[PDB]
């Protein structure tokens, strides 16, 4: 029994044995923010709000009591329209056009489980047990909409997940042109707020940053949550860092327009909302219908940020993710787009599945050009049908040769584009997302499909099915290569433009389900020019996602290191590519490539049959030793241990039991004179005794916890060591 | 000859000794921002903004060229539908139901002076020759909107002025969703940034920040520029202080929402809009019909803050306060509130005006109380008829006492409120701004007019009229009490609610500008619960303002400080009060309240009645001696020396001729054993010789400014000493 | 200066010893890659440009010198011949620290007519933002031309505007200006 | 050699730490209360911190704000002392290094100690520099060379270490020449 509702006091309160999260009736009817955080048993009131006549924080309608006020109080939510001048989580536009709303208690629910969110990625439970759900209505009287919070409390997580739910139980139709997620108000908090910006090619550094009086934003246009700034944002103590101190961890299953934002105000109170970007996002709820939001996954830990990344990691896994792979070891494949891009053929690439065989490779993945008249990036996307002059026998010949070879079969769609070269433009060109009159914007030359429309969906679902139907394709990666720039969808009512980004991804979300429903024993790998669509939303339909564009072995760490914050490191996929890098013109050596490779899910993306002889069996030992550690690697418990700008970046891996671990340590710059360093490790059992499997030394638990060993001298730059330990008895 | 165009190059070159501002029609007609600084000779292209492909960076229509994006070109101005991610300065909403705009250079035109603004305050010129206004005009060919982008540069200051008029010249409506008033985009620029936020008895501290990717914003939504967050804001180097650095100062000259936003991009550029806040906002912009946005002020300092500042305090005094009386010494008055709040009469009101007139005293302000039945803040606000219960005689007789002790008269008023219990809303109930069918919400118990129709003014304007006509009232205080909260406007369609806001705004400006047009002979103070409207285009009509309701010697040191950022010091009033503070409850020495005072412009709030013969003739000895200074104080170049949480603040006032020079050194705590400090000074003239006023001795520029002096070591917390030198002959 | 020949490492130990000495007192040898001190991988032009920020020399066997690098050398000292009045005795202006991703510096003659600019980036990233150099120690109303380019400019510009860094691929990369005022 | 008393000044102090092969980098901290001491026992005035300090404000960068400037003429053990006291002061001692320093001053006789180099700027470190750069160069330095451009020089150390006879190195000569080389 998780959640409790005091009627005395007026306060609700979810905990487990890890976290407390209080929230109360106030006056007016007023939901309240009091606490969240590490567990305790009871609650005395010792957190009411201290009454103060603070100057132009106006009061309740009919109020004479000035020291009362929605302007200064915590709250769990809030509107325009209420004498509440923070950033509001909701704004509705009225019929009078006004922009009132003003939300007052009416009624809570409890609930075993939790509810899905239709048309929405969400966690969920395999057992009821394992989690309730509180629900607070809250309704204007006098436009009856009725907002509905709800807060999952898992009973062995340190977890609790929010989202809202719109009614309009009214006359008339509203429109909803702002509805968060979720509120939190702070009060008496020195945060700093740690984020994870980035570009293409570049996503996800951490960054991390004082809070000034202010509103500091966030968020993405792009219709995806982007590369330049991910959906995820946390709140930390000073003093916090990898394995001490609070943090707060926020991440939003959205995979369209996210907005973050945190504000302190005049009072030093810190007040954070998170939801879909209200950027030309406006919603017309009839009479009776409802509007669902994205949840929010709120994770706290007492411990640093490994333990909060920790939780995450966890959640996502097991009760967000539902590819029937998300337990199974990742295949070690090989891409063939950094190593032929669109100069390619069946027989060129026959030779690299050849190559592949012997390195010890257990995928063949298939990237761009396979289709339509695919000769480069100006046409074709829309024509989801195998390009004769490269596969004159079929796709299902070279299909079936790859797995002649001993190999699964990969390939590469990106379902939501079309190009002005296209029959699919030909056939429908109103197909293609612009506004009437203009010409829409290019993208790496393409054009952007409007997913909203169902027959749109339905016209590359039934492209899709053809090829997949024969159950030859063993895993798909799913690409996506622009933002979305001109916003409409063609079949909407004027009033209801305001839609389009979130039907769209609804349509994105629709057609994916379909897809990876009807297609359990697909691998789904998702990509979006790299990671511009990496989020927790995005886990629920595919297992793993390409992490950046960017291979260099070094840019990497940051990146996947940014990238762990939040993410489990199963779902993060890193390849192997060649020297000078492609993308920044680095030279690394291959060793480092490879480790740092072994982060994330390994894969190749360069041309076998152009490697030497020392590189052939660097692969094969590289593979041959992946395969040994992987487990533990994939799945185990992450720790990041050194971040690059320390001049190292350094992170390991220990299961379940902690029986095993694997770590790495990377070194950026060489110096003529360099400073000895030591690694220590973390996720070790104190008393256990593990064995150094390269130098047969023994240490116990504790010792390489606190002593660690010397990182050992090497001249160069960018090199890597690689450790594996393992419990004895 | 400030002002050219190189058709060749397509550069525009805004320039004077001191600055140089260039922008250029870069591809597809898109206006890009190039420079802004220190003043150059000429231009030769280096600035030409790098061609590089962008991953997700997308291109003109129709455009193959990869290489340029108006996502990642430095802008003049930015629109929603251009394929720009960054926050635009505009948004416009199409008949059709989309934000599309796209906006591409038309034309330009260079003219004399600058044009007046419709309906707003503004800076102007009083000789043609002294500026030069560029007009750049950009269109949507398909909407047929057209943008006129302003540009205008005095010759002898460090400052570009901006705004934005919207022109509609299709057949159809549009809606301006958001129009900011400039925008400004900066490359390889490494800034903190700095505002002035505060609260109720709290304005205007002066906060710094780093500026990280993301978006950063600082705004009001109260339908006033607001105690919370100044419309103002400077980016500057990180090593920049009061002295020397670049310091780039914008301050929006507008008295309602404002929003400036200041993003650092995936590119590590910077991104500036600034105008009225989009909050609510939506302009209704019908065929044939423009909107003129308030402008903004652009200072470019190369030498420190103190600099900047005094290009700010030369801008509003000598080319937008229209008052008469900004160029004169203003009264060290008497103002009756702290003192006796609404208890009193007009015989105990003789008394006060006795004791003013021997303690040398010049004016006598009659604060709240004296009109409709107001014994209390719970009733006749909108009644502007004098309480005759206190006035027996009326109000007439009473001013003409004033005027016969020798003294100007002043009253209060607080023309934009309301009571539910007035005259006015027993008449007139409609005038009280309320979404129909919803109870408003109350602040100090009042409401708001909608001074956005003209009936509700002319109401106003006529009572105020009848009190003012036989020129008795010398000073008026024009006082406003709480925010905006229940935002509508009864006359207006249901699509145009989204102009409450501005609507509020312009009444506002259209009345005030009224009586201080018919009155030009009285000196208007403004007011607002403090500074809660102490902005720009306040200046422009009221001469000076309330700085705080904090009357605290110490606590007024940082709201002063933080003030004379952007606002001369004639422009803030500040009072000896009471000790203990009756709003923080400190205790401070008279002489200290007294020289906090004297960095405004210097009055008394205190019961002159109930004081001692003993005190009586400290207040003369203060009054007497700042009749001395007030000259120089009042209107010298203003030079801050040190901050608060220094331990001292310390400031200076030199008249333009570098003769005369007054020098505040102010201490907050006392220390058992306390370090040396010593005091330099600024501003005077290294090759004259000063005599300071109480020694005797005398010393050069060079001396001061170099060597400075040692403060001299007191006991005791809160104490002052004054400086005065004078260059011998 | 330093057993250290790193051209990225006598980056910082050139800057800091700027500090106090003049760069005439300081001696630079372009050596070996991968470097004998450190292991470092380097752009022969790199390794030229940094050192001809001290008293140019060479420390590597040059008979065992590839004829793309004999004839690199041969254009090196070359070009150094040109410039070594100005780089040795010029008055020294440091313009970046290597902290900030790159190192630059430059020379100015006593007149004002002459002035050598290094710029030199240590990291190369695959989404670069862009960077302008601004000068030190010129005459605002004479006229510089660049010597490579042909383009002239005001003193004052070449210290206000400045001008891009050309974005290039690679670590460790350097390019030099030469900038003469005219008539 | 000097010692100097600053009241009522928040200065930083910037030294040039270092190591064989890594000397002389930038630092830069904060002046609390205590000593702090920059010095060498190694006989030599030192790779591991160089005779010099400077004095700035928290502000002073390579282009503005005041910096002062020390320099000890002396090129065996030096000790910089720089002391924040009780009462908010800061106390500057810099001389020959006082371990294991006593020095028998019979009757009549007289003890001279290097001398230091102090300069003071109000524009940046660059300036700063500049004044050291002038005064060392020419009023200090009495090489005959000193005003002279100096040679494109090819030393043998990393070419060949002690692996090498005449003949190997005419070699080199022959090279040299060719290349352009002039010592
Ligand atoms: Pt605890
Ligand atoms: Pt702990
Ligand atoms: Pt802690
Ligand atoms: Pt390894
Ligand atoms: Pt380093
Ligand atoms: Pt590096
Ligand atoms: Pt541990
Ligand atoms: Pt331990
Ligand atoms: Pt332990
Ligand atoms: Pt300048
Ligand atoms: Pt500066
Ligand atoms: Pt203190
Ligand atoms: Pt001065
Ligand atoms: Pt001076
Ligand atoms: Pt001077
Ligand atoms: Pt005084
Ligand atoms: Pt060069
Ligand atoms: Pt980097
Ligand atoms: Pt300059
Ligand atoms: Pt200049
Ligand atoms: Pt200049
Ligand atoms: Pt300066
Ligand atoms: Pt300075």
């Given at each position: 029994?998780?959640?409790?509702?005091?009627?005395?006091?007026?306060?609700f309160?979810?905990?487990?044995?890890?976290?407390?999260?209080?929230?109360?009736?106030?006056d007016?009817?007023?939901?309240?923010?009091?606490?969240?955080?590490?567990?305790?048993?009871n609650?005395?009131?010792?957190?009411?709000?201290?009454?103060?006549?603070?100057?132009?924080?106006?009061?309740?309608?009919?109020?004479?009591?000035?020291?009362?006020?929605?302007?200064?109080?915590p709250?769990?939510?809030?509107?325009?329209?209420?004498?509440?001048?923070?950033?509001?989580?909701?704004?509705?536009?009225?019929?009078?056009?006004?922009?009132?709303?003003?939300?007052?208690?009416?009624?809570?629910?409890?609930?075993?489980?939790?509810?899905?969110?239709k048309?929405?990625?969400?966690?969920?439970?395999?057992?009821?047990?394992?989690?309730?759900?509180?629900?607070?209505?809250?309704?204007?009287?006098?436009?009856?909409?009725?907002?509905?919070?709800?807060?999952?409390?898992?009973?062995?997580?340190?977890?609790?997940?929010?989202?809202?739910?719109?009614?309009?139980?009214?006359?008339?139709?509203?429109?909803?042109?702002?509805?968060?997620?979720?509120?939190?108000?702070?009060?008496?908090?020195?945060?700093?707020?740690?984020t994870?910006?980035?570009?293409?090619?570049?996503?996800?550094?951490?960054?991390?940053?004082?809070?000034?009086?202010?509103?500091?934003?966030?968020?993405?246009?792009?219709?995806?949550?982007?590369?330049?700034?991910?959906?995820?944002?946390?709140?930390?103590?000073?003093?916090?860092n990898?394995?001490?101190?609070?943090?707060?961890?926020?991440?939003?299953?959205?995979?369209?327009?996210?907005?973050?934002e945190?504000?302190?105000?005049?009072?030093?109170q810190?007040?954070?909302?998170?939801?879909?970007?209200?950027?030309?996002?406006?919603?017309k709820?009839?009479?009776?219908?409802?509007?669902?939001?994205?949840?929010?996954?709120?994770?706290?830990s007492?411990?640093?940020?490994?333990?909060?990344?920790?939780?995450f990691?966890?959640?996502?896994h097991?009760?967000?993710?539902?590819?029937?792979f998300?337990?199974?070891?990742?295949?070690?494949?090989?891409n063939?787009?950094?190593?032929?891009?669109?100069?390619?053929?069946?027989?060129?690439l026959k030779?690299?599945?050849?190559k592949?065989?012997?390195?010890?490779?257990?995928?063949?993945?298939?990237?761009?050009?396979?289709?339509?008249?695919?000769?480069?990036?100006?046409?074709?996307?829309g024509?989801?049908?195998?390009?004769?002059?490269?596969?004159?026998?079929?796709?299902?010949?070279?299909?079936?040769y790859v797995?002649?070879?001993?190999?699964?079969?990969?390939?590469?769609?990106?379902?939501?584009?079309?190009?002005?070269?296209?029959?699919?433009?030909?056939?429908?060109?109103?197909?293609?997302?612009?506004?009437?009159?203009?010409?829409?914007?290019?993208?790496?030359?393409?054009?952007?499909?409007?997913?909203?429309?169902?027959?749109?969906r339905?016209?590359?679902?039934?492209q899709?099915?053809?090829?997949?139907?024969?159950?030859?394709?063993?895993?798909?990666?799913?690409?996506?290569?622009?933002?979305?720039?001109?916003?409409?969808?063609?079949?909407?009512?004027?009033?209801?433009?305001?839609?389009?980004?979130?039907?769209?991804?609804?349509?994105?979300?629709?057609?994916?389900?379909?897809?990876?429903?009807?297609?359990?024993d697909?691998?789904?790998?998702?990509?979006?020019?790299?990671?511009?669509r990496?989020?927790?939303?995005?886990?629920?339909?595919?297992?793993?996602?390409?992490?950046?564009?960017?291979?260099?072995?070094?840019?990497?760490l940051?990146?996947?290191?940014?990238?762990?914050?939040?993410?489990?490191?199963?779902?993060?996929?890193?390849?192997?590519?060649?020297?000078?890098?492609?993308?920044?013109?680095?030279?690394?050596?291959?060793?480092?490539?490879?480790?740092?490779?072994?982060?994330?899910?390994?894969?190749?993306?360069?041309?076998?049959?152009?490697?030497?002889?020392?590189?052939?069996?660097?692969?094969?030992?590289?593979?041959?030793?992946?395969?040994?550690?992987?487990?533990?690697?994939?799945?185990?418990?992450?720790?990041?241990?050194?971040?690059?700008?320390?001049?190292?970046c350094?992170?390991?891996?220990?299961?379940?039991?902690?029986?095993?671990?694997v770590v790495?340590?990377?070194?950026?710059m060489?110096?003529?004179?360099?400073?000895?360093?030591?690694?220590?490790?973390?996720?070790?059992?104190?008393?256990?005794?593990?064995?150094?499997?390269?130098?047969?030394?023994?240490?116990?638990?504790?010792?390489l916890?606190?002593?660690?060993?010397?990182?050992?001298?090497?001249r160069?730059?960018?090199?890597?060591?690689?450790?594996?330990?393992?419990?004895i008895?």
């Amino acid at each position: 029994n998780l959640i409790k509702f005091d009627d005395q006091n007026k306060v609700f309160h979810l905990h487990n044995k890890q976290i407390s999260y209080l929230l109360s009736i106030e006056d007016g009817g007023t939901l309240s923010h009091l606490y969240f955080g590490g567990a305790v048993k009871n609650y005395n009131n010792q957190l009411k709000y201290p009454r103060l006549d603070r100057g132009f924080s106006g009061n309740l309608p009919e109020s004479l009591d000035r020291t009362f006020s929605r302007d200064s109080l915590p709250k769990e939510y809030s509107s325009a329209g209420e004498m509440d001048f923070h950033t509001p989580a909701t704004i509705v536009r009225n019929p009078d056009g006004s922009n009132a709303l003003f939300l007052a208690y009416k009624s809570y629910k409890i609930e075993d489980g939790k509810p899905d969110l239709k048309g929405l990625p969400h966690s969920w439970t395999k057992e009821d047990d394992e989690a309730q759900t509180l629900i607070v209505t809250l309704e204007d009287k006098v436009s009856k909409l009725e907002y509905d919070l709800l807060y999952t409390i898992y009973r062995d997580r340190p977890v609790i997940v929010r989202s809202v739910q719109v009614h309009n139980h009214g006359e008339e139709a509203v429109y909803l042109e702002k509805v968060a997620s979720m509120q939190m108000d702070y009060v008496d908090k020195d945060f700093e707020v740690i984020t994870l910006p980035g570009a293409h090619a570049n996503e996800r550094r951490v960054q991390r940053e004082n809070i000034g009086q202010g509103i500091k934003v966030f968020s993405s246009y792009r219709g995806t949550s982007s590369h330049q700034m991910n959906p995820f944002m946390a709140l930390v103590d000073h003093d916090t860092n990898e394995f001490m101190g609070e943090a707060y961890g926020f991440a939003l299953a959205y995979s369209g327009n996210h907005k973050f934002e945190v504000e302190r105000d005049q009072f030093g109170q810190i007040h954070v909302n998170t939801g879909i970007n209200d950027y030309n996002f406006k919603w017309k709820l009839n009479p009776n219908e409802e509007f669902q939001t994205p949840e929010v996954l709120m994770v706290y830990s007492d411990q640093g940020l490994n333990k909060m990344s920790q939780a995450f990691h966890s959640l996502i896994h097991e009760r967000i993710m539902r590819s029937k792979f998300k337990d199974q070891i990742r295949p070690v494949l090989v891409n063939n787009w950094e190593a032929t891009y669109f100069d390619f053929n069946e027989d060129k690439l026959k030779t690299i599945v050849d190559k592949a065989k012997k390195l010890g490779l257990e995928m063949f993945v298939l990237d761009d050009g396979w289709f339509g008249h695919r000769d480069d990036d100006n046409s074709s996307l829309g024509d989801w049908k195998v390009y004769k002059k490269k596969f004159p026998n079929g796709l299902g010949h070279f299909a079936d040769y790859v797995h002649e070879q001993g190999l699964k079969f990969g390939l590469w769609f990106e379902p939501e584009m079309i190009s002005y070269e296209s029959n699919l433009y030909k056939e429908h060109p109103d197909y293609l997302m612009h506004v009437p009159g203009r010409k829409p914007c290019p993208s790496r030359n393409q054009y952007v499909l409007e997913l909203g429309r169902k027959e749109v969906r339905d016209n590359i679902f039934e492209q899709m099915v053809k090829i997949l139907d024969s159950k030859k394709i063993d895993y798909i990666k799913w690409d996506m290569n622009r933002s979305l720039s001109d916003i409409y969808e063609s079949d909407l009512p004027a009033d209801q433009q305001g839609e389009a980004y979130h039907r769209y991804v609804l349509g994105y979300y629709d057609l994916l389900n379909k897809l990876v429903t009807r297609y359990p024993d697909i691998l789904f790998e998702g990509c979006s020019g790299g990671g511009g669509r990496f989020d927790v939303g995005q886990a629920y339909y595919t297992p793993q996602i390409w992490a950046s564009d960017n291979t260099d072995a070094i840019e990497r760490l940051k990146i996947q290191y940014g990238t762990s914050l939040v993410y489990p490191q199963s779902m993060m996929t890193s390849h192997v590519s060649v020297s000078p890098n492609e993308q920044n013109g680095r030279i690394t050596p291959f060793n480092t490539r490879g480790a740092v490779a072994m982060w994330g899910d390994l894969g190749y993306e360069l041309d076998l049959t152009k490697m030497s002889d020392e590189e052939s069996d660097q692969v094969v030992k590289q593979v041959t030793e992946y395969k040994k550690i992987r487990e533990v690697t994939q799945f185990g418990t992450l720790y990041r241990l050194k971040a690059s700008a320390s001049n190292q970046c350094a992170w390991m891996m220990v299961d379940s039991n902690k029986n095993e671990a694997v770590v790495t340590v990377v070194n950026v710059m060489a110096h003529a004179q360099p400073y000895c360093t030591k690694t220590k490790l973390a996720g070790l059992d104190p008393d256990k005794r593990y064995k150094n499997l390269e130098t047969d030394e023994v240490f116990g638990g504790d010792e390489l916890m606190h002593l660690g060993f010397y990182d050992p001298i090497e001249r160069g730059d960018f090199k890597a060591k690689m450790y594996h330990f393992k419990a004895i008895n």
